[PDB]
A paper describes a structure:
The Hsp90 molecular chaperone collaborates with the phosphorylated Cdc37 cochaperone for the folding and activation of its many client kinases. The cochaperone phosphatase PP5 dephosphorylates CRaf and Cdc37 in an Hsp90-dependent manner. Importantly, for RAF proto-oncogene serine/threonine-protein kinase (CRaf or RAF-1), a member of the Raf family, the Hsp90 cochaperone, Serine/threonine-protein phosphatase 5 (PP5) has been directly implicated in its dephosphorylation and inactivation.
Beyond these features within the kinase complex, two new densities were visible. A complete atomic model constructed using the consensus and composite maps clearly revealed a PP5 conformation quite distinct from that found in the autoinhibited crystal structure. Instead of sitting atop the PP5 catalytic domain active site, the PP5 TPR domain was disassociated from its catalytic domain and interacted with both Hsp90CTDs. In its activated conformation, the PP5 α7 helix bound in the amphipathic grove formed by Hsp90CTD helices from both protomers. Here, the PP5F148 and PP5I152 residues which were solvent exposed and disordered in the PP5 autoinhibited state, were stabilized by Hsp90 hydrophobic residues (Hsp90A: L638, L654, L657 and Hsp90B: I680, I684, M683, L686). The PP5 linker connecting the catalytic domain to the α7 helix has conserved acidic residues (PP5D155 and PP5E156) that lie in close proximity to Hsp90R679 and Hsp90R682, stabilizing the α7 helix within the Hsp90 amphipathic groove. Surprisingly, the PP5 catalytic domain was not located near the readily dephosphorylated CRafpS338 but was instead located on the opposite side of the Hsp90 dimer, with the PP5 active site facing the CRaf C-lobe. The PP5 TPR and catalytic domains are separately bound to Hsp90, liberating the PP5 active site for activity and placing the phosphatase domain near its substrates.
Author numbering:
A (entry chain B): 120 to 220, 273 to 694
B (entry chain A): 604 to 691
C (entry chain D): 456 to 488, 507 to 610
D (entry chain C): 2 to 260
The structure:
Amino acid sequence: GADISMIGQFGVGFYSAYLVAEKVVVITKHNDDEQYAWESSAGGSFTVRADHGEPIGRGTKVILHLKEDQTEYLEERRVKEVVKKHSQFIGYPITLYLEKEKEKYIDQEELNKTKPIWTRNPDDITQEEYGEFYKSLTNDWEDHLAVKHFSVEGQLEFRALLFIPRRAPFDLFENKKKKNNIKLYVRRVFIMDSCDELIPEYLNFIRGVVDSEDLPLNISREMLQQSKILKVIRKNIVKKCLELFSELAEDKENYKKFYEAFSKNLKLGIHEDSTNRRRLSELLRYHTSQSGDEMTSLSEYVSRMKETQKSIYYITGESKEQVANSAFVERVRKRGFEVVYMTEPIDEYCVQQLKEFDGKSLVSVTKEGLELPEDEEEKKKMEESKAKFENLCKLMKEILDKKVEKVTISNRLVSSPCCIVTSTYGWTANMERIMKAQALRDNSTMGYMMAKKHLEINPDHPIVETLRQKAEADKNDKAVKDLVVLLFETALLSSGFSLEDPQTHSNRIYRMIKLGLGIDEDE
Amino acid sequence: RIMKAQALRDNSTMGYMMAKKHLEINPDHPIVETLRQKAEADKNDKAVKDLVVLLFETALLSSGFSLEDPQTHSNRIYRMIKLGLGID
Amino acid sequence: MDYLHAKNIIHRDMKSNNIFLHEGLTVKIGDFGGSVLWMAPEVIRMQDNNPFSFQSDVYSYGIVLYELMTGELPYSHINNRDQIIFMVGRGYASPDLSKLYKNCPKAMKRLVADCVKKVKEERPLFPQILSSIELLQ
Amino acid sequence: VDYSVWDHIEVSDDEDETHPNIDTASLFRWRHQARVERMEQFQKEKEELDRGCRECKRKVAECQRKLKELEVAEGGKAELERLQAEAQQLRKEERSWEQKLEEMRKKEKSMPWNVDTLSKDGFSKSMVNTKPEKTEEDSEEVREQKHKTFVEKYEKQIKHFGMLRRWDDSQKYLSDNVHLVCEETANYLVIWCIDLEVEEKCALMEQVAHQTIVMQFILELAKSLKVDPRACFRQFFTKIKTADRQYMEGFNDELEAFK
Ligand SMILES: Nc1ncnc2c1ncn2[C@@H]1O[C@H](COP(=O)(O)OP(=O)(O)OP(=O)(O)O)[C@@H](O)[C@H]1O
């Protein structure tokens, strides 16, 4: 139990000089002996000669004579690149010597300025000094938002440092495959960049280093001989940077600054991390009908959730105000419920997998069969409405039969004549919109995932009441047929479906303007 | 359309990048002819103000541009359809 | 199932629901899944508390293969809960071949009939079943 | 250099061994379940082992106490003799429990490693960087503080920039520009092309053209976007496009001629 650890085990590394040199010379002087010179061209034999040059006092000189093919290792830029990459955390200073141009000379120091501060105890490191390390580690201009320092002991022994960058980098969503955010060190010598095995794809915004004292290394010391040990590292890392967020979530003003910078990455991991999505869902926040100025946690919805609610009501669409005004939302607002607004394309992919939260199911406000708890004095109105409108909805299908699967009276409308909702299974209007717009997805096989449109009408609203009077006189009257396509088009348009034939609607509203201007017969 | 549908939008930068619109009118068309005759008879007519927006929105749709608020287009179309059904 | 069983991994009550069918020619085993159970009688009885042996899953595969062949529940008209529990547990019952489709050729319908006969048997045939169905295609 | 300690490790949640005909996310939770149940049956085996050990240890000890009592004032051999047969049977049973005690620790060694046998936690600390200070200072005192510190920097720039309108000085410059993250530079180089407009030599002003066109384009993009001019970066200067070549000389003429 002496307190040194060194990089010595294999015994072959010195002969790597002959990758680059044609001849090698070593002058050494050890205490308790005289100075000798050792020389070889890797030719199967070497010579040892007592040296009589300048006094060294103590030390070694390794003189490589280079191959012409390798001349670039003499240059300042390549010595800088290599020592920064591989060796910047050697304890002892590393120094370089060159010329100036007044005219003559320089020496240069500190190719390894930065100390490997993860060796120091976390009580003895200031929040300034962590930030000073981070800048250099990442080559950034600005400090970290938060940091985690931990260690593991037993058979797999390591130190670690984790940083949460303050603003996402411009390239974060992109796939340049450098995977350099996490660095693996053994005994303070660099082994590898993470190569997507130390941290999951969606957590790749984390900058840090892992340092362990021993690991089954490959003969070139670039790789691990037992690959599974990288996964046992990743299960520790992933678990702890999750804990980091929670602590960060007690600091509300920093949390919103984190969340606005990285929110999608959480959601991207709901879609992919089948184990931790319980934990990750508690980190989500959204806008809602209540507190429309600031996001609220999904647990807070439950806290406020009325004793009669059985589910969490949500709606997805192109913006906050477009969602807040949408025709599906009026009844749930009137009845004092809370609607969650989900206004990003990525919300569809996390909502596919987040089927429930805290034992409560998530229900879409834009799907058929929407249940909102019933009053018996409402239930009787619904029954007599269903009875009186039966002819209108039957005749409306009899005209519109190609386009809708089903037609019925609406339960979620106030202040609009009609709306269109999708079947329970398949893409709602917004997910159709997004899937149609993908650059590299084959939509030909959509047939099993496309939902079917069920049309619902407001029994109270004047236009639908008038339409039962209009349909009453003549079931075959084209003038009521012509509404039930125009109203359908107008309802589609509000619900997020594209017109597959937009010119027809346009020409209708231009024929409407020929009414509004008194020129409908061109006279 | 495509950029707005991407999962990994990077939405702030695209919110700058989106380029602006120019409206084109057909000089020979009965609508433009009428609207001009109306606007020449009274430049400040609330009817031509209400027209120019209704006309404009229709051109967004035919050009591939979505509305800011599809609901208010539909309310304005229903303010017209209540004439169409004699309701109010 | 073949790739699975090679790892001594057993889930009881393999069924037609816990399997998922996706876009493309794409069918894939899951875990989500009184209630509609399908069982070897060894599992039904109180007798041995770990009825874990692979043969149970093979015979339960034989049941879901007959669902694939019938497109309607086994025992759907024959029984209520008392008869379907008791007679199967006593080893004294079979679902009807009336619902098994005759648009199947002799090769696979006979192999499915052997998947009924496996109730009588202790044979963990999965790689050889796989060979048999594969080659009969 | 033996690595045999690392030979066998069990990892649930491994993507390198998912079968294509199985729902991957189902298989991980299902493979995790098997690990924990295997461990619990082996923990139960340690309880039944210890039950067997305790019974033998106690019953041999009770037999030994009665043997020692029966050796005091000997006479009536039946007890003392039968306790040799009881000690023998209890020892024979104990030797089976000793074989099971060896089999226990041998099986604990022979089972593969996993995520919570390989490891136990050491120290752990989590810190949040409570924000840097924000401030404001007069246009005169900041422009003086920049200029008085920049009398060496902008000399070092016209010299290191000194090869015209191509890649070379970017290798030297972009690291030094970390000092210039604070710069507001738009004034100085141009006040310098303004300094001797009556008399100045073409090379040094053509380097102001180059510095100012590249930096001023960046500053226009930094107004046009959220970005810091160190974070947005001269990777974009690789572009062959006509917008560098034609427009550069057009503005060189405009900015030289007007003053
Ligand atoms: N400058 C030096 N001063 C003292 N001893 C040295 C020096 N350079 C090499 N050695 C000696 O030469 C031996 C061989 O070194 P070499 O790099 O080839 O193997 P190693 O360091 O032991 O293992 P590895 O291949 O992993 O680096 C060392 O173990 C050490 O005894």
